[PDB]
Amino acid sequence: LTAAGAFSSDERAAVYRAIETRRDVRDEFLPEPLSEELIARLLGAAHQAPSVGFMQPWNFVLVRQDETREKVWQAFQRANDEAAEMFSGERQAKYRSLKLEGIRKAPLSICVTCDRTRGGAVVLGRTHNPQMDLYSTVCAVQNLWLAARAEGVGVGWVSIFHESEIKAILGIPDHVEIVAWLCLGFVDRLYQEPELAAKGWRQRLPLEDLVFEEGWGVR
Amino acid sequence: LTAAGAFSSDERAAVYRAIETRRDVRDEFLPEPLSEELIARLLGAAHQAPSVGFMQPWNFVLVRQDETREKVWQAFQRANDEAAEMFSGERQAKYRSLKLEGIRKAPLSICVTCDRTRGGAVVLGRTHNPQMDLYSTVCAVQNLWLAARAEGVGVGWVSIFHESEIKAILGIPDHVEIVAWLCLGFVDRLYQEPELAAKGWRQRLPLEDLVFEEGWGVR
Numbered sequence: 001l002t003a004a005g006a007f008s009s010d011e012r013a014a015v016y017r018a019i020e021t022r023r024d025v026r027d028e029f030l031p032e033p034l035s036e037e038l039i040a041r042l043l044g045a046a047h048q049a050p051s052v053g054f055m056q057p058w059n060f061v062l063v064r065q066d067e068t069r070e071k072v073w074q075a076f077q078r079a080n081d082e083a084a085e086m087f088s089g090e091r092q093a094k095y096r097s098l099k100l101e102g103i104r105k106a107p108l109s110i111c112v113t114c115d116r117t118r119g120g121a122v123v124l125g126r127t128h129n130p131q132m133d134l135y136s137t138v139c140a141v142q143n144l145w146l147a148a149r150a151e152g153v154g155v156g157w158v159s160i161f162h163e164s165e166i167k168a169i170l171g172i173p174d175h176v177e178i179v180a181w182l183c184l185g186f187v188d189r190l191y192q193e194p195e196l197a198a199k200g201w202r203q204r205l206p207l208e209d210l211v212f213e214e215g216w217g218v219r
Numbered sequence: 220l221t222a223a224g225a226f227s228s229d230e231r232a233a234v235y236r237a238i239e240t241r242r243d244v245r246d247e248f249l250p251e252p253l254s255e256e257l258i259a260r261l262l263g264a265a266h267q268a269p270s271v272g273f274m275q276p277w278n279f280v281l282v283r284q285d286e287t288r289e290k291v292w293q294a295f296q297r298a299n300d301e302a303a304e305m306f307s308g309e310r311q312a313k314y315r316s317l318k319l320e321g322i323r324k325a326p327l328s329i330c331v332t333c334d335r336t337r338g339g340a341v342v343l344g345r346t347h348n349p350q351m352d353l354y355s356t357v358c359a360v361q362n363l364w365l366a367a368r369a370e371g372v373g374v375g376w377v378s379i380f381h382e383s384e385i386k387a388i389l390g391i392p393d394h395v396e397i398v399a400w401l402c403l404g405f406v407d408r409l410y411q412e413p414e415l416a417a418k419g420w421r422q423r424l425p426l427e428d429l430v431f432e433e434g435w436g437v438r
């Protein structure tokens with residue numbers, strides 16, 4: 001191991017800047033396809049994420065073809081109606097007015113998976129909680145999300161669809177699970193605050209309400 | 220929605236630096252306690268994580284008392300002893316030589332949770348995949364992990380426990396699930412590559428093997 005310490009004041013600010021300004025993008029994606037060098041930098045970042053027992057359970061299916069995107073867009077439309085039907089009156093009306101994906105607008109989509117059987121018969125760290133491999137994959141997703149923000153690339157997560165239908169479309173095996181569908185594209189404008197707060201779905205919760213000292217429910 | 224901010228070469232390099240150098244810390248934690256201000260910045264960064272339907276399902280239990288950490292350490296011991304028992308021969312020997320936690324060395328611990336019942340009866344984006352809220356919580360963790368690296372704070376995830384025992388120790392409710400137990404503490408020494416790779420458990424997988432074009436298994 002080597003010497004380490006807090007980043008410089010400027011470096012530190014940049015990190016918090018990416019965390020503080022990245023957004024889930026749906027409708028502002030620009031049309032230019034991302035270059036191979038850019039994609040390589042993003043995947044490289046996701047690959048540097050931590051992983052239970054250093055399992056490195058992720059895979060990335062790069063989707064750029066119009067037909068595939070349209071196919072997946074259709075899978076989303078199918079499931080979203082079912083989703084909306086779960087709400088009523090104002091909310092349902094509101095839910096239907098929201099844009100919850102940019103699958104056809106974003107020139108690139110990445111299906112991020114978790115190979116449930118990678119790592120052998122037993123994987124370190126997953127022995128007592130079977131979901132640790134999926135969690136590891138989400139860590140890869142957040143790293144990508146942040147690096148993309150720094151690159152001027154917007155990212156959007158779309159979790160509204162029947163997984164079995166996406167797996168059939170991409171040919172994903174039974175032993176592999178889809179953790180996230182990400183829509184990517186350059187963006188020149190962003191919402192200063194979560195889009196769902198701006199459109200009155202839910203507001204930012206007070207952080208002081210979520211932190212406890214030594215025991216649950218104790219401030 | 221307004222003009223997006225643009226990152227300079229240095230700002231961007233800082234983000235990648237945090238991503239490429241953060242480590243899962245087990246044994247390099249220093250004893251200097253973290254300031255209240257510092258902790259606040261870390262939780263703030265965590266709270267800026269994306270969350271399905273903007274559910275914001277997380278809670279953070281700050282643990283600093285020796286008795287509590289000793290109990291969690293014992294819970295870890297029991298769990299780790301049964302984990303090792305899932306391995307045999309040489310692997311078992313190596314598994315037993317690995318340090319998989321810094322519960323008693325790190326001056327601070329944070330039990331990160333996920334309130335499964337927050338967001339009401341139906342949560343946007345979680346309608347077709349019930350694990351979306353848990354994944355959201357992981358995003359907050361990764362944000363905290365990166366921010367910590369920038370502040371010169373080491374962070375380690377400990378997943379080897381029996382959840383029920385930890386919940387009992389902290390008085391965590393049935394409707395709340397534990398996603399991660401993090402050990403935090405200043406560090407001035409970090410490994411250059413994953414400790415688990417250095418110690419011969421698993422090596423870094425070739426990224427080229429995990430990336431497919433348009434369809435699974437397709438190069």
Ligand SMILES: Cc1cc2c(cc1C)N(C[C@H](O)[C@H](O)[C@H](O)COP(=O)(O)O)c1[nH]c(=O)[nH]c(=O)c1N2
Pocket residue numbers: 022023024026099100101157158159160193194195196267268269270271272273344351352354355358
């Ligand atoms: C696991 C998970 C799953 C989803 C999301 C997030 C996460 C963490 N989000 C994005 C979510 O709605 C979003 O984070 C906030 O509403 C936007 O916050 P920011 O603008 O990203 O800070 C999301 N957004 C969307 O429009 N359609 C979707 O299906 C999903 N699915």
Ligand SMILES: Cc1cc2c(cc1C)N(C[C@H](O)[C@H](O)[C@H](O)COP(=O)(O)O)c1[nH]c(=O)[nH]c(=O)c1N2
Pocket residue numbers: 048049050051052053054125132133135136139241242243245318319320375376377378379412413414415416
């Ligand atoms: C969901 C999940 C759960 C755990 C981990 C990670 C993740 C993502 N890791 C850390 C893991 O072993 C480590 O990230 C890799 O071996 C290399 O990490 P870095 O590249 O050094 O961060 C971990 N480490 C450890 O010593 N004890 C543990 O119980 C766990 N649990």
